Short mmCIF file of C-alpha atoms in Angstrom, two decimals:
data_model
loop_
_atom_site.label_atom_id
_atom_site.label_comp_id
_atom_site.label_asym_id
_atom_site.label_seq_id
_atom_site.Cartn_x
_atom_site.Cartn_y
_atom_site.Cartn_z
CA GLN A 1 4.39 4.36 -11.72
CA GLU A 2 3.97 0.85 -10.37
CA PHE A 3 1.88 -2.15 -11.43
CA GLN A 4 1.54 -4.90 -8.84
CA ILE A 5 2.18 -8.18 -10.66
CA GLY A 6 3.12 -10.46 -7.78
CA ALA A 7 1.50 -12.84 -5.34
CA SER A 8 3.31 -11.18 -2.43
CA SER A 9 3.33 -7.54 -1.36
CA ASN A 10 5.82 -5.48 -3.35
CA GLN A 11 6.40 -7.12 -6.70
CA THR A 12 5.94 -4.54 -9.41
CA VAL A 13 7.10 -3.08 -12.70
CA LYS A 14 7.88 0.60 -13.09
CA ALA A 15 7.15 2.96 -15.98
CA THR A 16 8.91 6.31 -16.31
CA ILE A 17 7.86 7.65 -19.73
CA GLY A 18 9.83 10.83 -20.32
CA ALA A 19 8.44 14.19 -21.37
CA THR A 20 7.71 14.85 -25.03
CA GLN A 21 6.54 18.44 -25.33
CA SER A 22 8.05 20.58 -28.06
CA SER A 23 9.93 22.66 -25.49
CA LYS A 24 11.85 19.70 -24.08
CA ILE A 25 12.79 17.28 -26.87
CA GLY A 26 15.14 18.75 -29.43
CA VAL A 27 17.74 20.79 -27.55
CA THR A 28 21.05 20.98 -29.39
CA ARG A 29 24.28 22.73 -28.39
CA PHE A 30 25.94 25.31 -30.63
CA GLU A 31 29.39 26.84 -30.20
CA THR A 32 31.45 29.34 -32.16
CA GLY A 33 34.88 30.84 -31.61
CA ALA A 34 36.27 34.29 -32.18
CA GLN A 35 37.72 35.36 -35.51
CA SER A 36 41.14 33.72 -35.70
CA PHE A 37 43.86 36.05 -36.96
CA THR A 38 46.75 33.73 -36.02
CA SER A 39 48.11 30.66 -37.80
CA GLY A 40 49.95 27.58 -36.63
CA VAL A 41 49.57 23.83 -36.24
CA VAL A 42 46.56 22.97 -34.07
CA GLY A 43 45.44 19.80 -32.34
CA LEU A 44 42.04 19.68 -30.68
CA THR A 45 41.08 17.50 -27.74
CA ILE A 46 37.44 17.00 -26.83
CA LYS A 47 37.24 15.93 -23.20
CA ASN A 48 34.78 13.42 -21.74
CA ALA B 1 -4.43 -23.70 5.99
CA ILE B 2 -2.39 -24.65 2.93
CA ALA B 3 -5.50 -24.62 0.75
CA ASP B 4 -6.48 -21.16 1.93
CA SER B 5 -2.97 -19.86 1.32
CA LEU B 6 -2.99 -21.35 -2.18
CA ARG B 7 -6.44 -19.91 -2.90
CA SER B 8 -5.28 -16.48 -1.79
CA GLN B 9 -2.20 -16.75 -4.01
CA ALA B 10 -4.23 -17.93 -7.00
CA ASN B 11 -6.68 -15.04 -6.65
CA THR B 12 -3.82 -12.57 -6.24
CA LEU B 13 -2.15 -13.86 -9.39
CA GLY B 14 -5.47 -13.73 -11.23
CA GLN B 15 -5.78 -10.06 -10.36
CA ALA B 16 -2.13 -9.43 -11.19
CA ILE B 17 -2.83 -10.71 -14.70
CA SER B 18 -5.41 -7.95 -15.09
CA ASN B 19 -2.96 -5.41 -13.70
CA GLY B 20 -0.43 -6.52 -16.31
CA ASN B 21 -3.00 -6.27 -19.08
CA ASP B 22 -3.84 -2.73 -18.00
CA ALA B 23 -0.14 -1.86 -18.01
CA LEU B 24 0.08 -3.21 -21.56
CA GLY B 25 -2.91 -1.12 -22.56
CA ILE B 26 -1.41 2.09 -21.20
CA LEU B 27 2.02 1.46 -22.69
CA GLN B 28 0.60 0.51 -26.10
CA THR B 29 -1.50 3.67 -26.12
CA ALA B 30 1.54 5.84 -25.42
CA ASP B 31 3.74 3.99 -27.91
CA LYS B 32 1.28 4.08 -30.81
CA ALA B 33 0.74 7.76 -30.02
CA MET B 34 4.45 8.58 -30.35
CA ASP B 35 4.35 7.58 -34.03
CA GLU B 36 2.60 10.73 -35.20
CA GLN B 37 5.11 12.88 -33.34
CA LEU B 38 7.87 11.01 -35.14
CA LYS B 39 6.27 11.63 -38.53
CA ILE B 40 5.68 15.30 -37.70
CA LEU B 41 9.33 15.74 -36.77
CA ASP B 42 10.35 14.10 -40.03
CA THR B 43 8.13 16.55 -41.92
CA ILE B 44 9.61 19.48 -39.99
CA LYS B 45 13.11 18.41 -40.99
CA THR B 46 12.06 18.02 -44.61
CA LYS B 47 10.52 21.50 -44.65
CA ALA B 48 13.61 23.03 -43.10
CA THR C 1 -6.68 5.11 -1.53
CA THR C 2 -2.94 5.32 -2.28
CA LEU C 3 -0.41 2.98 -3.85
CA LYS C 4 1.80 2.24 -0.85
CA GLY C 5 -1.35 2.07 1.24
CA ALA C 6 -2.62 -0.66 -1.06
CA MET C 7 0.62 -2.61 -0.83
CA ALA C 8 0.41 -2.37 2.95
CA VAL C 9 -3.24 -3.44 3.12
CA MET C 10 -2.11 -6.48 1.12
CA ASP C 11 0.19 -7.56 3.95
CA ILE C 12 -2.43 -6.76 6.58
CA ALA C 13 -4.96 -8.97 4.81
CA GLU C 14 -2.40 -11.76 4.49
CA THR C 15 -1.69 -11.58 8.22
CA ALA C 16 -5.42 -11.60 8.93
CA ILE C 17 -5.87 -14.77 6.88
CA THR C 18 -2.98 -16.34 8.78
CA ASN C 19 -4.57 -15.49 12.14
CA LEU C 20 -8.01 -16.79 11.21
CA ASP C 21 -6.46 -20.04 10.01
CA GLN C 22 -4.59 -20.35 13.30
CA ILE C 23 -7.84 -19.94 15.24
CA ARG C 24 -9.87 -22.31 13.07
CA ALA C 25 -7.18 -24.93 13.64
CA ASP C 26 -7.78 -24.71 17.39
CA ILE C 27 -11.52 -25.11 16.90
CA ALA C 28 -10.80 -28.20 14.81
CA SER C 29 -8.46 -29.63 17.45
CA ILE C 30 -11.07 -29.33 20.18
CA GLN C 31 -13.71 -30.82 17.89
CA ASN C 32 -11.66 -33.92 17.10
CA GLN C 33 -10.87 -34.43 20.78
CA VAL C 34 -14.56 -34.19 21.66
CA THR C 35 -15.49 -36.69 18.95
CA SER C 36 -13.02 -39.24 20.29
CA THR C 37 -14.32 -38.72 23.82
CA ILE C 38 -17.89 -39.27 22.63
CA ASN C 39 -17.04 -42.53 20.89
CA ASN C 40 -15.24 -43.93 23.92
CA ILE C 41 -18.05 -42.85 26.25
CA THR C 42 -20.69 -44.38 24.00
CA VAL C 43 -18.91 -47.72 24.24
CA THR C 44 -18.18 -47.52 27.97
CA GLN C 45 -21.81 -46.75 28.77
CA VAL C 46 -23.01 -49.90 27.01
CA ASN C 47 -20.44 -51.99 28.85
CA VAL C 48 -21.35 -50.44 32.21
#
């Protein structure tokens, strides 16, 4: 949404207020692996 | 010619001031409204 | 009745002001020329 604040034609500020319903704000990410029956030294690596 | 251009620019800026004030009004409304959502989320976390 | 339409009507009005100034300048030019003619004629008639 624009708000003309200039002497000439297309000066403006822009507002892009996001959505804030309760179906769109708090969306976490869960994960869980299988039951590990094996041992050994492990090194994780989270990518990106 | 120069005086008419300057008068046009002064009137345009005078109206742009009102556009900016309306933008401030809208944004302040939204901002001060977000506060109750913040407090409600805090209460939800406390109840959980 | 629409945002971009408003920002276009702004330019169209600016161009209109420019054109009317350009025409009024021609009226003024002819008027000054006529005034000078009238002064010179008023003197020449007395001398004649």
